[PDB]
Amino acid sequence: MTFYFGYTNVELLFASLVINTPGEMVAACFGCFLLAVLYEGLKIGREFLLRRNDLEDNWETLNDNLKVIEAAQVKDALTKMRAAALDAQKATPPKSPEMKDFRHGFDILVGQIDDALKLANEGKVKEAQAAAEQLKTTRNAYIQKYQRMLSMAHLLQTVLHVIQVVVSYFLMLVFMTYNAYLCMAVAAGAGLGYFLFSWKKAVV
Which of positions 137-156 make contact with a second copy (CB under 8 A)?
154
Residue among 190, 200, 203, 204 that touches a second copy (CB under 8 A): 190
**Rounded Cα–Cα distance for residues 65 and 81 (Å):** 7
| Residue 112: burial class (beta carbons within 10 Å; 0-12, 13-18, 19+) | buried
Binding of residue 1 to a second copy (CB under 8 A): yes
CB atoms within 10 A of CB 14: 8
Binding of residue 72 to Cu ion (CB under 5 A): no
Site map 100..139 versus a second copy, x via CB under 8 A = ----------------------------------------
Binding of residue 172 to Cu ion (CB under 5 A): yes
Binding of residue 166 to Cu ion (CB under 5 A): no
Binding of residue 86 to a second copy (CB under 8 A): no
Which of positions 164-183 make contact with a second copy (CB under 8 A)?
165-166, 169, 172-173, 175-176, 178, 183
Question: What is the Cα 39 distance to its own chain's centre?
Answer: 16
CB atoms within 10 A of CB 145: 12
| Exposure string over 20-53, b if 16+ CB within 10 A, otherwise e | eeeebbeebbebbbebbbbbbbbbbbbeeeeebe
CB atoms within 10 A of CB 63: 15
Binding of residue 194 to a second copy (CB under 8 A): yes
Nearest approach, Cβ of 175 to Cu ion (angstroms)? 8
Among the listed ranges 64-72, 106-114, 140-148, 193-201, the one in contact with a second copy (CB under 8 A) is 193-201
DSSP string across 27-89: HHHHHHHHHHHHHHHHHHHHHHHHHH--HHHHHHHHHHHHHHH----HHHHHHHHHHHHHHHH
Task: Give the residues lining the site for Cu ion (CB under 5 A).
Answer: 172, 176
Task: Give the residues lining the site for a second copy (CB under 8 A).
Answer: 1-4, 11, 13-15, 154, 158, 161-162, 165-166, 169, 172-173, 175-176, 178, 183, 186-187, 190-191, 194-195, 198, 202
